[PDB]
Design brief:
It is classed as photosynthesis. The complex is a heterohexamer, with three copies of chain A and three copies of chain B. Chain A is mainly alpha-helical. Chain A contains eight helices and no strands. Chain A has a single domain (about 1-160), classed as Globin-like. In chain A, helix 4 crosses helix 8 and helix 7 runs antiparallel to helix 8 (about 145-160). The longest helix of chain A has 26 residues, at about 20-45. Chain B is mainly α. The chains are: A mainly alpha, B mainly alpha. Bound molecules: phycocyanobilin (9 copies).
Chain lengths: ~160, ~170, ~170, ~160, ~170, ~160
C-alpha cells in the first residue's frame, strides 16, 4: 500500500541498498504532517453517518431520476438506497484511511483500482459520486492543515471519477 | 508492504470499521517517537559492515565446524555468500524499523527462506545464531548513549529485537 | 487444441483406425447445424458484458458475505478481478462451442485453476455458483426466439450447458 | 492440431478477445467445404487396402533395387515389405484424416513433423514415398470438389518429401 | 562440472587434505592412457547417428508396442523426439568419457529426467533398454581393433559402460 | 570447476554439439602438461609445512605490527598466529590443487571468488598474503616446467590480491 514510508522502502529495495538520509528526511516530513492528518481522521470519523446521510440526499436532489427510474442500478427501491448509502459510506471511510496512511494508498488499493470497470459493468454514473464528494468537501467542517489534507484526498477521488 | 499506519488501516478495512480513537492515539505515540526510530535506522545503516563482521566472528568462534574444510562457510565464495545473507537480513530489518511493520521483512526476505536453506544444505539453526548475534551488535550500536540527545528508546529496542527474533525463527 | 473433427481423428489415430461411417455421419450432422452453432457464439459474444453483470448480481445477492468488508470480492480491485474471471471463463466457453470440443477450455482455462484459487483463497464453490448463473443467462440469450429463423437448438444448448458445467466442476 | 476452426480460436485467444464476425465467416466456409471432404474421406477409406497394395507395387516397379538389395531399409525381406505397406497405409489413413479435419493438421502433427529426420536416420528415400503418392493421386477414383480436396493434401505431402 | 582431476581435488578439499601420492599416481595412469580415451570419444562422436539408429531399431524390434498406433514412439514427431533423446544421452556420455567423470551427465542430463518422463508418460524402462542398446553399439565401434594402434582398452570400455548404465538407472 | 577439459565440454555443450577435433587436441595438450604438473604437486605437498612456517615468518618480518598491534585481524595472539598459519596453508594447498587440475579452477572456486569481500570485512591486508606468496615462489625448490607451472598459479594469486 502506497505511503511515503512504503515508497521510500520500495525505492531503496529496488536499488538493493539501505535507506539514505533522503529517505529518513521523507519520514520526518511524513511525521510532521501526521498529527494534523490524524486529527482530521478523528473529525471525519465522528461526522461520518451525518456526512453519508447528507451526501446521499445531495445526489438524489441533483439527479432526481435515481430515486424514481426502475432498474438494478438505481436508488428507486429500499435495496438501491441501501447500496447507495453503503457506497457513499465506503468513500468517507476510505478517505479517513488516507488521512491515517499519509497518502492515497487506501483509495488506490480499495476503491480507485477497478473503479471504471465496476461503474461500467453495474451502470453506475461517476457523476453521482462526484456530487456526493462535493457535498462531503463542503460539510466536513475541518479548517487549516486538516481541511487541506482532507480536500487533497476528496479532489483525488473526484479526479479518479472524471 | 504495509507500514504501521496501513497495518492499522488494513485490519480496520477487513472489519469495515473506522480506525478507533485508541488506535489513532497509538499511532500519534509512534509519530512523537519518530526521531528516535530514525536514529535506530541511521545508526544500524551506518554501522552495517561492523554489525555483520562482529556477528560472523562470534558465530564462527561458537561454531568452528562452519569454517573447517567441508563446512558450509568454508571457502571465500561460501563465506562471502554467508556475509551477504547476514547483510540482506539486516537491510530488511532496517526497513521494518523504518516502516514500523514486519510485512516487508516477511514478504521480501523471510517467506520461503527456510525451504531455500533446506534445499542448499545451509544450516538454518546456525543462520539463526548469526541473526541473534547481529541483534546484540545492532542494539549496542543503536542504543549507544554517546552523540545523541538522552532519552528512553526501550520500546524501539524491543521492537528492533522482535524483527531479528522473527528472522531467526523463520530460518530455524 | 482439438475441434470436433480432430477429436474424432485423434481417437481414431490412437487405434490406428479409419474414422467410421457412423462418426463421419455424426460430423455431417454438426456441419448441417453449423449456422445455429455460430448463432450461439455470436449471441453470447455480443452480450458478454450483460451475461457477466447479471451472473455477478445474482451471485452477490445469494452470497452477500463475498461483498461484505473482508469478503473475497470486496474492494473494486477484487470485484474487477472476479468480473474478469467470469469474462475469461465465458470467452473460453464460447471457443469450446465454436470448435465443438472442450479441449481449449480444459487446456487454456480450467487445468490447474482449482489449485490457483486454493492458493489465492478465492472460494471455488462461489466461482462455480457464478459460472452456473452465467450458464442460465447465456442460454436465455442464445436461445431467444426473437430475431432468428425458428428451429430447434436443444442439442446446442445442452452442449453449451455442458461446457459451463465442466468449468463449474473444475473450480468446486 | 491445425484446422480452420482451431486457427480462428488460436488467433482470438492470442489477442485476448472473443471471436469476431471474420472468425464466424471462417467457420461458415469450413462448413460449406465439409460435406464434399467428408464424402472424399468415405471414398478413400473404402479403397484404402486396394490403394496401398497398388502404390507399394508402383514403388517396387520404379525402384526395383528396393525388392532385391539387402539392408534394414529395403523391402527385400518379408518384414521390409510389411514396413513399406504399413508406411504407405499411414499416408493414406492420415490423408483421409485431413479431409475430415478440413486442413493439413493431421499430416503436420502425425507424419510431416520429424519426417526428414526419420528418413535420414533410417535411410528411407523420400522419392519412394513420392512415387507411392503419385499412384494414390492417379487411382483414388474421386472427381469434382472431393478430388481437388484429396489432391491438395497429396500434393502437400509430396511437397513435404521434395 | 568436474573432471577426473577436479573430482579428486574436490574430495580432498572437503577433508582439508592434500591429494595423496596414490591418488596422483592414479591420475598419472589416466594421463598415460589419454590417447585411448580420446579414441573412444572420437569414434562414438563420428558414428553417433549409426549408434542411435541401430539402438532404436533394436528397441522397436523388442518392443513393437512403442511404434504401434497409440504407442509412445508412433508418429514421426514422437519418433524424432525419441531419437533426439538417445542422441542427447549419447552426447553427455561422450562428455563424461572425455572428462573422466559422470558429473556433467548427472547435472546436465540425468538429474530430474525420471520425473520429466513420468510427467510426459514416456516409458522410462523402455528408454533404459534403448540406452543399453546404444551401450552395446558404442562399445562395438569404440573397441573396433581395425584402424587403431593395437592395445588394451578394457578399463575404458568398462568406464564407458558405467556411464550408459548410470543413464539407464536414472530413467528406469 | 574450470580446467581445460571442463572448459572444452562447456564450449561444446553451449553449442548443443559433440566434441570436435579441436577439443580432443585441447585434451592432448592438457595430458602432455600433466605429468610435470603432477610432479610439482608432489614436490610442494612434501614441503607444505616448511613453506607455511617460512612464509608466515616472512610476513611477520615485513609487517612487524601484525605480531604486536592488538586487534581481531592481527597475529599478536596465539589464535591470530593460528589463523594466519591456517590461511597461508590454504594458499599452498589450493595452489597444489591447481597443479593437479591443470588450471586455475581450484584457486578461482575455493579462494579468489569472494577474496576481496572477505579481506575488507575482516580487515586483512592483501599485502600480507602477497608477501607470503613471494616467499613460497622463492622457496618451493622446483625448477624447469614444474616451477613455471607453480609460478603461473602463485603469480595468478598475487595478481588477484593486487
Ligand atoms: C535511542 C535510539 C537513543 C536516543 C535517541 C533519541 N534521539 C532524539 C532526538 C533526535 N533524533 C534525531 C534524528 C536524526 N537527525 C538527523 O539529522 C537524522 C538523519 C536524517 C536523524 C535520524 C533528531 C532530528 C532528533 C531531534 C534533535 C536532536 O538531535 O535532539 C531523542 C530526543 C527525543 C526526541 O524524540 O526528539 C532521543 C531520546 N537517545 C538515547 O539516549 C538513546 C540511546
Ligand atoms: C438457437 C440457437 C436458435 C435458432 C437458431 C437458428 N439459426 C438459423 C439460421 C441461420 N443462422 C445464421 C447465423 C449467422 N448469420 C450471420 O450473418 C452470422 C454472423 C457471421 C451468424 C452467426 C445463418 C447465416 C442462418 C441461415 C440464414 C438465416 O438467418 O435463416 C436457423 C435455421 C436452421 C439453419 O441451420 O439454417 C435456426 C434454427 N433458432 C431458434 O429459434 C433458436 C432460438
Ligand atoms: C581402444 C579404444 C582401442 C585402442 C586404442 C589405442 N589408441 C592408441 C594410440 C593413439 N590414439 C590416438 C588418438 C587420436 N589421434 C588423433 O589424431 C585423434 C583426433 C584428435 C585422436 C583421438 C593417438 C594420437 C595415438 C598415438 C598414435 C597412434 O595412433 O598410435 C593406442 C596405443 C597406446 C597409446 O596410449 O598410445 C591404443 C591401444 N587400441 C585397440 O586395439 C582398441 C580397440
Ligand atoms: C596472516 C597472513 C595474517 C592474519 C590472518 C588472519 N586471518 C583471519 C581470518 C580469516 N581468514 C580467512 C581466509 C580464508 N578462509 C577461507 O575459507 C579461505 C580459502 C579456503 C581463506 C583464504 C577468513 C575467511 C577469515 C575470517 C573467518 C575465520 O575466522 O576463518 C584472522 C582472524 C580475523 C578475525 O577478525 O577473527 C587473522 C588474524 N592476520 C595477521 O596479522 C597475519 C599477518
Ligand atoms: C551465513 C550466516 C550462513 C551461510 C549462508 C549461505 N547462504 C548461501 C546461499 C544463498 N543464500 C540465499 C539467500 C537469499 N537470497 C536472497 O535474494 C534473499 C532475500 C530474499 C536471501 C535471504 C540464497 C538465495 C542463496 C543461494 C544463491 C546464492 O548463493 O546467491 C550460501 C552458499 C551455498 C552454496 O552452496 O553455494 C551460504 C554459505 N552458510 C553458513 O554456514 C552460515 C550459517
Ligand atoms: C449512489 C451514489 C447511487 C447508486 C448506488 C448503487 N451501487 C450499487 C452497486 C455497487 N456499488 C459498488 C461499489 C463499491 N464496492 C466496493 O467494494 C467499493 C470500494 C470499497 C465500492 C465503491 C459495487 C462494486 C457494486 C456492485 C456489487 C454490489 O452489489 O455491491 C448499486 C446496485 C447495482 C446493481 O446492479 O445491483 C446501486 C443502486 N445508485 C443510485 O441510483 C444512487 C444515486
Ligand atoms: C468471481 C466470481 C470470484 C472471485 C475472483 C477472483 N479472482 C482473483 C484472481 C485471479 N483469478 C485468476 C484467474 C485466471 N487467470 C487467467 O489468466 C485465467 C485463464 C487461464 C484465469 C481463469 C488469476 C490467475 C488470479 C490471480 C492473479 C490476478 O489477479 O490477475 C481475485 C483477486 C484475488 C486477490 O487476492 O487479489 C478474485 C477476487 N472472487 C470472489 O469472491 C468470486 C467468487
Ligand atoms: C516403402 C515405401 C519402402 C520402405 C519402407 C520402410 N520403412 C521402414 C521404417 C520406418 N518407417 C517409418 C515411418 C513412419 N512411422 C510413423 O510413425 C509414420 C507416421 C505415422 C511414418 C510414416 C519409421 C518411423 C520407420 C522406422 C521405425 C520403425 O521400424 O517403424 C523400414 C524399416 C527400416 C529399418 O531400418 O528397420 C522399411 C523397410 N523400404 C523400401 O525399400 C520400400 C520401397
Ligand atoms: C526414446 C528412446 C523414447 C521416447 C522419447 C520421447 N521423449 C519425448 C520428449 C522429451 N524428452 C525430453 C528429454 C530431454 N530434454 C533435454 O533437454 C534433455 C537434456 C537435459 C533431455 C534428456 C524432454 C524434455 C521432452 C519433452 C519436450 C520435448 O519434446 O522437447 C517424447 C515426446 C513426448 C510427447 O508426448 O510429445 C518422446 C516420444 N519415447 C519412446 O517411446 C521411447 C522409449
Amino acid at each position: 500500500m502506497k505511503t511515503p514510508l512504503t515508497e521510500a522502502v520500495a525505492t531503496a529495495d529496488s536499488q538493493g541498498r539501505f535507506l539514505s538520509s533522503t529517505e529518513l528526511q521523507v519520514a520526518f516530513g511524513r511525521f510532521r504532517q501526521a498529527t494534523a492528518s490524524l486529527d482530521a481522521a478523528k473529525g471525519l470519523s465522528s461526522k461520518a453517518q451525518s456526512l453519508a446521510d447528507g451526501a446521499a440526499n445531495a445526489v438524489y436532489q441533483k439527479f432526481p431520476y435515481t430515486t424514481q427510474m426502475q432498474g438494478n442500478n438505481f436508488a428507486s427501491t429500499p435495496t438501491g438506497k441501501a447500496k447507495c448509502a453503503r457506497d457513499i459510506g465506503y468513500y468517507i471511510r476510505i478517505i479517513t484511511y488516507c488521512l491515517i496512511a499519509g497518502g492515497t494508498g487506501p483509495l488506490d488499493d480499495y476503491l480507485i483500482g477497478g473503479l471504471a470497470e465496476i461503474n461500467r459493468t453495474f451502470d453506475l454514473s461517476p457523476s453521482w459520486y462526484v456530487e456526493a464528494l462535493k457535498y462531503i468537501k463542503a460539510n466536513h467542517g475541518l479548517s487549516g492543515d486538516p481541511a487541506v489534507e482532507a480536500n487533497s484526498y476528496i479532489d483525488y477521488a473526484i479526479n479518479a471519477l472524471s | 508492504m504495509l507500514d504501521a499506519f496501513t497495518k492499522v488501516v488494513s485490519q480496520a478495512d477487513t472489519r469495515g470499521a473506522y480506525v478507533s480513537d485508541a488506535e489513532i492515539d497509538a499511532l500519534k505515540e509512534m509519530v512523537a517517537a519518530g526521531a528516535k526510530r530514525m536514529d535506530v535506522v541511521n545508526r544500524i545503516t551506518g554501522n552495517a559492515s561492523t554489525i555483520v563482521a562482529n556477528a560472523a566472528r562470534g558465530l564462527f568462534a561458537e561454531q568452528p565446524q562452519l569454517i573447517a574444510p567441508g563446512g558450509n562457510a568454508y571457502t571465500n565464495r561460501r563465506m562471502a555468500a554467508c556475509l551477504r545473507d547476514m547483510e540482506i537480513i539486516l537491510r530488511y530489518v532496517t526497513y521494518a524499523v523504518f516502516a514500523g511493520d514486519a510485512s516487508v521483512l516477511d514478504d521480501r526476505c523471510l517467506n520461503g527462506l527456510r525451504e531455500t536453506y533446506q534445499a542448499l544444505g545451509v544450516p538454518g539453526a546456525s543462520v539463526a545464531t548469526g541473526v541473534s548475534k547481529m541483534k546484540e551488535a545492532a542494539i549496542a550500536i543503536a542504543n549507544d548513549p554517546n552523540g545523541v540527545t538522552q532519552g528512553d528508546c526501550s520500546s524501539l529496542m524491543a521492537e528492533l529485537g522482535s524483527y531479528f527474533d522473527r528472522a531467526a525463527a523463520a530460518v530455524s
